[PDB]
Design a protein around this ligand. Structure first.
Ligand SMILES: [Cl-]
Length: 245
């Protein structure tokens, strides 16, 4: 467990984040923003010192955010993080990083982030699953330079997103986008209609090799939104759901 009593929010950092992700800057932080805000506290738990990087080569596989109420740019926040549920995967060791962000003594925003830390495991002899696979609602175009900018703003400088040598050392043929860049970028416009209490579940699949041109599909429903971002192969970079609580 790591604990941070009172963490102020810099409105400039929110603005800069909203600008880079293409999201709206206003009185409420964007739904995904407390990922960036808390991340250096998250990695101080694994490292013991403040460290603003996911472990080099780590792969973000899943993220579940439950927002009970919006967090104001003017709020200061209580932060508590914990690590749990180590388990083996074919391509490494998954761990869950569970974050509680409070305003007053109430929990406004909760997150389960699962990172895959690459390494051989006893499941590594075992075959590659297959995937689970028209004109899109929008097209995301993502450059190395947008992702160098995202690194500065979103609390994670893991150099597999910015330096090709680092990427290559960890199995990637070019630099790749951060998972949470893309998780934030897909919310553009759509976010205007979110209720204040909302859950956002993201599953990450094919790495977003840069430069990337990627088609975004959005089905709106009574419950909320189903999102899929893909590369036209046409396999998924992510699939996700937004649901009003
Ligand atoms: Cl990532």
């Amino acid at each position: 467990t790591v604990t941070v009593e009172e963490l102020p929010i810099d409105p400039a950092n929110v603005a800069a984040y909203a600008a880079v992700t293409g999201l709206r800057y206003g009185n409420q932080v964007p739904l995904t923003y407390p990922f960036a805000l808390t991340f250096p506290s998250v990695m101080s738990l694994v490292t013991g010192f403040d460290f603003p990087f996911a472990a080099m080569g780590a792969i973000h596989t899943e993220n579940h955010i439950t927002q009970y109420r919006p967090i104001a740019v003017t709020d200061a926040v209580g932060v508590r993080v914990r690590a749990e549920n180590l388990r083996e995967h074919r391509r490494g060791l998954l761990v869950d990083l569970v974050t509680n962000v409070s305003v007053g003594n109430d929990v406004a925003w909760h997150q389960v982030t699962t990172f895959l830390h690459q390494q051989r495991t006893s499941l590594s002899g075992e075959p590659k699953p297959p995937p689970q696979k028209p004109p899109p609602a929008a097209v995301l175009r993502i450059t190395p330079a947008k992702i160098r900018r995202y690194a500065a703003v979103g609390g994670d400088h893991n150099p597999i997103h910015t330096n090709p040598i680092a990427a290559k050392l960890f199995g990637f043929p070019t630099v790749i986008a951060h998972g949470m860049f893309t998780a934030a970028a897909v919310l553009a416009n759509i976010e205007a209609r979110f209720p204040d209490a909302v859950r956002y579940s993201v599953r990450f699949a094919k790495p977003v090799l840069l430069p990337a041109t990627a088609g975004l599909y959005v089905a709106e429903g009574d419950g909320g939104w189903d999102l899929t971002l893909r590369n036209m192969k046409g396999y998924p970079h992510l699939t996700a759901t937004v649901r009003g609580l």
